[PDB]
Design a binder for these strands. Structure first.
Ligand SMILES: [Zn+2]
Length: 86
RNA sequence: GGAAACCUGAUCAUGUAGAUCGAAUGGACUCUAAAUCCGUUCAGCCGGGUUAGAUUCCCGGGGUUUCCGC
């Protein structure tokens, strides 16, 4: 499993995973320089580094999650898309 | 010029989903206050190796500190 920058990982899945292991659905994301600006379906906005070595990058290279965000309304199809990356 | 240690909100830790703090935000409560609490969110400086799996081990870059040297 090659270690790519975070924007590649969310570009492939369309999903975000928070520090609590919660999956959110990405509504918008945009890169600027080394930052990513992200807007979830549930309304949360966040600004992170576009690192290939971050904690959330490690989570997105793996296939586990603790819970899905209710307000994001993640479909079983998208969740399954995340679980079967390989 | 050379050696060692460490790494970007803070302190610490770390091969099988790191932690605590702090901050942003929503709510509860409240008197549409303060205080308090709860939910949500925020991480590995960069570029590679190795690995089933790495912020974590190895190499390199950059930076900081300490130490050695014309
Ligand atoms: Zn959400």
């Amino acid at each position: 499993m090659d270690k790519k920058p975070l924007n590649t990982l969310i570009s492939a899945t369309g999903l975000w995973m928070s520090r609590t292991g919660t999956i959110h659905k990405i509504k918008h994301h945009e890169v600027s320089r080394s930052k990513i600006y992200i807007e979830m379906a549930c309304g949360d906005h966040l600004v992170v580094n576009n690192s290939r070595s971050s904690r959330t990058a490690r989570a997105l290279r793996h296939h586990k999650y603790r819970k899905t965000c209710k307000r994001c309304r993640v479909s079983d199809e998208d969740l399954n898309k995340f679980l079967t990356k390989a």
